[PDB]
Amino acid sequence: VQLQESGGGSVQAGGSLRLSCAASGDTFSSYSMAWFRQAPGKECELVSNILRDGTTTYAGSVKGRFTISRDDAKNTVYLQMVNLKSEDTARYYCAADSGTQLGYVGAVGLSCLDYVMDYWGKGTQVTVS
Amino acid sequence: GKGEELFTGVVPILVELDGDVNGHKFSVSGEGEGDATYGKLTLKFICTTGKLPVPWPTLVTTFVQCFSRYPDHMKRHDFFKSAMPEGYVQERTISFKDDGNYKTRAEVKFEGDTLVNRIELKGIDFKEDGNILGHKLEYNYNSHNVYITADKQKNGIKANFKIRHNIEDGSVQLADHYQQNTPIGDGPVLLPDNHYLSTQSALSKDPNEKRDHMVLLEFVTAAGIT
């Protein structure tokens, strides 16, 4: 499986962005999907999950502004962000996993990879001005 | 809290495990001590049934997170100590990639002044030719985080994480961990916000020990909340 993020870039504070992540192959629906983000000099954060069973979770700082969703036909996961703030500036990564996923959100350590996932996208920069 | 106060000094630890992996039966007895002030564990485990049929490193996570150092600003998130002295049940499923799984049930509680971890382990569907039953893991251990989420319904917590076990040929064997902890007592416990335990483990041998055994020096520190 390859994961490819798109839909990032620059945006005004108060604006919106929809990140997309497309998976290759024919095995998507069984994966729990997640969005991580990391800003310079900070711990990586798991910001939102959508589990295999459909359950969604969100870091407290984005609850009510971010919405995660998946399309098991297009094999894609999305992160709709509204009312973006400077605090949201970071590189955002898509990840997929077939192991135990319980909906953890929050800091995961100095590397996103410290939270072990089967597959990772290369990420996309989001810069809020 | 009463629970927390039990850990301000050095506490003796006893670990006892009965195991059955693919029908291979074994028992392990361990002794040591924990000093939660420093998140420090020193433990020596001995296989009392002869040769351990699985690699020592695969049993590290199974062989007392109540000894984690919770920074003062995070003390309200320490479920493990809050459940003491009556203790907690810790259950795991550990799934080795492309191989078998362990299921463990342990009770962690005080017996007198001693913190005891009593474990039953069942392993099934392993390959005799695989990294586990074939003893192909290196005798070392990487640093890992343990990701904790609350389980209000059971008045406890859950955790998940994967362990990366170095293999002798240079590859890595993943061990996915599902964990649940529930209090043995019916009294109040602390239910945490999401956070993680950062854990470093060093494996060694006692030069004067002829039995199959493992010496473990481990440091566990809670993190993720500012």
Side-chain angles (χ1 to χ4, degrees), chain A residues 6-33:
Chain A
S6 65
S10 287
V11 60
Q12 278 200 30
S16 60
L17 277 185
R18 186 202 202 195
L19 306 187
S20 286
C21 168
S24 69
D26 65 334
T27 63
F28 187 77
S29 70
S30 62
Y31 284 96
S32 294
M33 306 293 300

Side-chain angles (χ1 to χ4, degrees), chain A residues 43 97-112 114-118, chain B residues 93 97 145 147-149 158-162 164 174 176-179 194-196 223-224:
Chain A
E43 289 192 40
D97 193 64
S98 64
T100 299
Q101 294 304 330
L102 304 178
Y104 182 91
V105 291
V108 299
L110 288 171
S111 176
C112 296
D114 291 341
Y115 190 101
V116 184
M117 303 288 278
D118 284 339
Chain B
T93 297
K97 180 71 175 179
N145 295 335
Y147 300 95
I148 295 173
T149 50
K158 290 187 180 186
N160 68 280
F161 55 99
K162 312 197 190 191
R164 297 158 293 109
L174 284 164
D176 173 80
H177 283 61
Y178 166 76
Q179 177 179 335
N194 298 348
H195 66 284
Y196 62 89

Side-chain angles (χ1 to χ4, degrees), chain A residues 18 21 28-29 50 69-78:
Chain A
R18 186 202 202 195
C21 168
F28 187 77
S29 70
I50 186 166
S69 64
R70 69 193 294 159
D71 184 328
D72 287 340
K74 294 183 179 177
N75 295 352
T76 51
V77 66
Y78 305 95

Side-chain angles (χ1 to χ4, degrees), chain B residues 99-150:
Chain B
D99 212 330
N101 63 88
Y102 296 161
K103 284 191 175 58
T104 65
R105 186 190 181 276
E107 302 193 12
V108 188
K109 69 184 174 189
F110 278 87
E111 296 290 350
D113 75 340
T114 300
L115 188 286
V116 172
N117 184 15
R118 291 173 170 96
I119 312 145
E120 297 299 325
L121 176 156
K122 180 86 176 298
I124 66 179
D125 295 326
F126 286 88
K127 292 176 292 185
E128 291 281 353
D129 185 57
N131 291 326
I132 295 83
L133 291 178
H135 294 272
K136 313 188 184 176
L137 272 70
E138 303 276 358
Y139 193 73
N140 53 35
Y141 216 91
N142 301 305
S143 177
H144 295 88
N145 295 335
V146 171
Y147 300 95
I148 295 173
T149 50

